[PDB]
């Protein structure tokens, strides 16, 4: 079934953006330098020895890329470290610290691997920004291909190009396109990780993210997961556009826990819980006058509270009139038995095991849009079941700050909280550094794939063996 190609306008926009990229001053890439051994004591030795070599003229004459390439081909032992560096000075200072077992922002170092697989966090609320995904789309052939694949599916489903949005700095995102585009980007980022050998042990979803979570847990084909986010997204945009003024439901974050909310809500009979986000943070929704009132009641009581700006009212009665069209649109999707674990924040945070019964039903998407997102509960259930590595696939890492609030509450004070892209951070670097972290903690990640195949020998270094 012939899928639409990249649009004319997208090609035009790409050309322009490449032209402009080609004119910025090239910045030195971030190179990851892996050092490992069966023993931490020996890992530090190799570190200090590599550093000593990099000090010498031969080592100063070798590119960081070559040193990283050689390093990446050593046997990767139980105890691991990666110094992420842009030049020789950075590299040496990082290695000094690995050797001294001292800490630094560009160094990661552990005595041994994390016991349980990573949980991939698929969220999206509040993570959008204007240029999101663009730079990685221009710079990374594997990302770009997956973006283009979702872009084709959305043209087919919805009639416009998400990739045109990504490329056009003049174009901003609204209720509908914000969602379909964060989705595109979640899909492509996860597949970029798969390409480098990463896998999720489990997923957890948060509202918009739930459809990407289904895909990566093998619960729906890419097509059907695109179908799920497309129906949610366009129906939500259309539904708000037809409502006016104080009939538009708002959302806000307030520093009250589930228990405090049952009390507080007796004053605000139309407020509902959108996302139980953290143990003492809840995104609530309803009529503006009640939202403003709960906001002021919080600010008064000495409690954090921030109103959001989106006339989306996911997880409120404002979704009531879309349920029927939603049900109708997703007739025909095929839920499949998952291939990894799922913490279902739609089902109150409950775990479904690889091999379980399909849970990606039409009724599932109906349930998820209308009802509360049990995010903190899902994350608590992961922590309690031995998971300690949380990786957010996002254009900006807002849900990991929520994850941290739950990990800490549950007694897990040193979780591995791994972000992907971020606004104000080079996207190619970010991915490097995310892959370095995965590698370091022992999770699947073929670190050889972080360097292109050697053509000649100057692509290697004479690293002290």
């Amino acid at each position: 079934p012939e899928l639409p190609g990249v649009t004319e306008e997208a090609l035009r926009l790409k050309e322009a953006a490449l032209e402009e990229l080609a004119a910025q001053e090239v910045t030195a890439p971030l190179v990851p330098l892996a050092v490992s051994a069966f023993l931490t004591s020996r890992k530090k030795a190799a570190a200090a020895e590599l550093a000593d070599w990099m000090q010498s003229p031969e080592g100063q004459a070798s590119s960081l890329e070559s040193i990283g390439r050689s390093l990446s081909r050593r046997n990767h032992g139980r105890s691991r470290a990666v110094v992420l560096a842009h030049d020789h000075d950075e590299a040496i200072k990082g290695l000094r610290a690995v050797a001294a077992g001292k800490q630094a922002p560009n160094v990661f170092s552990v005595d041994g691997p994390v016991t349980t697989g990573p949980v991939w966090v698929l969220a999206g609320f509040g993570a959008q920004h204007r240029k999101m995904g663009k730079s990685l789309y221009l710079r990374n052939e594997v990302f770009a291909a997956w973006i283009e694949k979702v872009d084709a599916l959305v043209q087919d489903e919805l009639g416009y190009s998400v990739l045109e949005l990504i490329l056009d700095d003049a174009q901003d995102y609204g209720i509908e396109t914000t969602q379909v585009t964060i989705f595109a980007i979640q899909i492509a980022l996860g597949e970029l990780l798969r390409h480098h050998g990463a896998k999720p042990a489990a997923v957890i979803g948060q509202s918009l993210g739930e459809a990407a979570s289904a895909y990566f847990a093998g619960g729906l084909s890419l097509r059907d997961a695109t179908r799920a986010i497309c129906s949610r997204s366009h129906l939500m945009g259309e539904g708000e556009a037809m409502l006016f003024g104080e009939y538009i439901r708002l959302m806000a974050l307030v520093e009250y826990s589930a228990d405090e909310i049952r009390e507080v809500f007796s004053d605000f009979p139309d407020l509902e819980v959108c996302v139980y986000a953290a143990p003492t943070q809840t995104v609530i929704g309803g009529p503006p006058e009640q939202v403003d009132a709960i906001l002021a009641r919080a600010e008064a009581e000495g409690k954090f509270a921030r109103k959001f700006a989106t006339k989306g009212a996911s997880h409120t009665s404002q979704m009531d009139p879309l349920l029927g069209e939603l049900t109708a649109e997703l007739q025909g999707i095929k839920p499949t038995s998952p291939t990894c674990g799922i913490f279902s924040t739609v089902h109150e945070g409950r775990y479904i095991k690889p091999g379980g019964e399909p849970i990606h039903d039409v009724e599932y998407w109906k349930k998820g849009l209308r009802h509360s997102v049990y995010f903190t509960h899902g994350i608590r259930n992961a922590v309690d079941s031995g998971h300690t590595t949380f990786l957010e696939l996002a254009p900006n890492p807002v849900a990991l700050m929520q994850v941290a609030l739950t990990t800490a509450d549950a007694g897990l004070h040193d979780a591995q909280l791994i972000p992907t892209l971020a606004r104000k951070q080079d996207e190619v670097s970010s991915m490097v550094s995310t892959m370095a972290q995965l590698y370091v903690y022992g999770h699947d990640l073929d670190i050889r794939t972080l360097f292109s195949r050697a053509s000649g020998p100057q692509d290697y270094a004479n690293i002290p063996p």
Partner: peptide, 9 residues
């Protein structure tokens, strides 16, 4: 404040 290389802070 999550930094340069993936750090909650």
């Amino acid at each position: 404040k999550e930094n340069f290389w993936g750090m909650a802070v």
